[PDB]
Amino acid sequence: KNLRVVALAPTGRYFASIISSLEILETAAEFAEFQGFMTHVVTPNNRPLIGRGGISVQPTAQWQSFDFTNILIIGSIGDPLESLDKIDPALFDWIRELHLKGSKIVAIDTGIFVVAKAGLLQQNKAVMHSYFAHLFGELFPEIMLMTEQKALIDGNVYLSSGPYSHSSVMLEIVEEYFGKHTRNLGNQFLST
Amino acid sequence: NLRVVALAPTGRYFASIISSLEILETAAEFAFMTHVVTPNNRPLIGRGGISVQPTAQWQSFDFTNILIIGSIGDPLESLDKIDPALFDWIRELHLKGSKIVAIDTGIFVVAKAGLLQQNKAVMHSYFAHLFGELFPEIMLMTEQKALIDGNVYLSSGPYSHSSVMLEIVEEYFGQFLSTIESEG
Numbered sequence: 001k002n003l004r005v006v007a008l009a010p011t012g013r014y015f016a017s018i019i020s021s022l023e024i025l026e027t028a029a030e031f032a033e034f035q036g037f038m039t040h041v042v043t044p045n046n047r048p049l050i051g052r053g054g055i056s057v058q059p060t061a062q063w064q065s066f067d068f069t070n071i072l073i074i075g076s077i078g079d080p081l082e083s084l085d086k087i088d089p090a091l092f093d094w095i096r097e098l099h100l101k102g103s104k105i106v107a108i109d110t111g112i113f114v115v116a117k118a119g120l121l122q123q124n125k126a127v128m129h130s131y132f133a134h135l136f137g138e139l140f141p142e143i144m145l146m147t148e149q150k151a152l153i154d155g156n157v158y159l160s161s162g163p164y165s166h167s168s169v170m171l172e173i174v175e176e177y178f179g180k181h182t183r184n185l186g187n188q189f190l191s192t
Numbered sequence: 193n194l195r196v197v198a199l200a201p202t203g204r205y206f207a208s209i210i211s212s213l214e215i216l217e218t219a220a221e222f223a224f225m226t227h228v229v230t231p232n233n234r235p236l237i238g239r240g241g242i243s244v245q246p247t248a249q250w251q252s253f254d255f256t257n258i259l260i261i262g263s264i265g266d267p268l269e270s271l272d273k274i275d276p277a278l279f280d281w282i283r284e285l286h287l288k289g290s291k292i293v294a295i296d297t298g299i300f301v302v303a304k305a306g307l308l309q310q311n312k313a314v315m316h317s318y319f320a321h322l323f324g325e326l327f328p329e330i331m332l333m334t335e336q337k338a339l340i341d342g343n344v345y346l347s348s349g350p351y352s353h354s355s356v357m358l359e360i361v362e363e364y365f366g367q368f369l370s371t372i373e374s375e376g
Binding site for chain 2: 005007013014015016017018019020022023024026039040041051052053054055056057058059060061129130131150162163164165188189190191
């Protein structure tokens with residue numbers, strides 16, 4: 001009847017992939033002619049993001065208003081060495097809880113460092129792109145990087161390295177909720 | 193010190209403008225002033241309940257090194273409603289030496305502006321018919337997702353524009369670059 005996506009965009013330095021993921025998800029919901037699909041961008045302090053090219057991005061929901069969601073997307077944190085330790089602990093608690101309650105958790109780009117830190121991976125295996133793979137190895141040497149995959153699914157946790165291509169994960173989620181034809185229409189839209 | 197102006201005609205499909213700026217600006221840190229503008233200089237209403245407020249007006253720009261024209265969504269709805277003055281501005285910048293980078297249905301904008309001197313383009317197969325009806329003299333290169341015609345660069349995408357972006361980076365600057373390229 002209704003599906004909710006909450007997309008946490010930790011930094012305006014790298015928020016495009018959050019926006020592209022929502023564009024793909026909503027487009028597929030239109031192909032499915034599904035009427036109860038609701039998405040929300042939220043920011044870690046519920047303040048505007050400062051994006052590139054002199055833009056300000058103002059959300060209209062606070063992350064604290066969401067006790068439940070079907071899908072949570074955790075976007076880029078930019079350079080984890082800069083940001084990871086600065087993330088509000090209450091926000092880690094919120095991700096941890098949503099995961100415990102059964103939300104799908106989709107982590108893209110350095111958002112993967114957030115799910116690593118939070119212990120969401122049941123099997124302790126992950127993926128990261130070459131630019132940040134060394135650092136991921138330094139921080140999480142107990143997590144095996146699957147070096148020939150760009151994406152990985154572990155229970156309800158979906159990882160997509162990107163940084164900008166997240167087709168396999170997004171289409172997987174599309175097929176789960178909307179079925180094969182919608183996924184295939186999605187795939188055709190994406191000209192993969 | 194190099195200038196990039198990025199026109200984002202619709203909040204329905206603007207992510208690919210933003211990613212293009214993130215790639216370019218990030219590339220330059222290893223070595224841009226960039227500016228997002230909207231056709232009416234008002235905020236875009238993007239997905240997920242956000243509004244995206246620009247801080248420059250497109251009229252303010254008399255020169256740029258790169259102009260990027262984003263998605264216009266469904267051209268059937270949007271192409272006719274684009275301010276004619278914006279086509280003049282595109283044409284003027286191009287004459288003053290700007291690279292003109294058209295992504296996704298942004299390609300209809302540059303086709304209509306008359307910039308495809310060699311009458312070739314690229315377009316997603318699902319919009320190829322509409323594109324042919326509007327631009328019957330332009331040939332579509334069915335097996336290509338990107339095309340360069342002089343200073344005009346086309347990239348269908350909708351979201352992966354790595355080849356055109358990296359081409360441009362190489363023009364200006366001669367693991368990060370590999371991370372971008374590997375997604376092609």
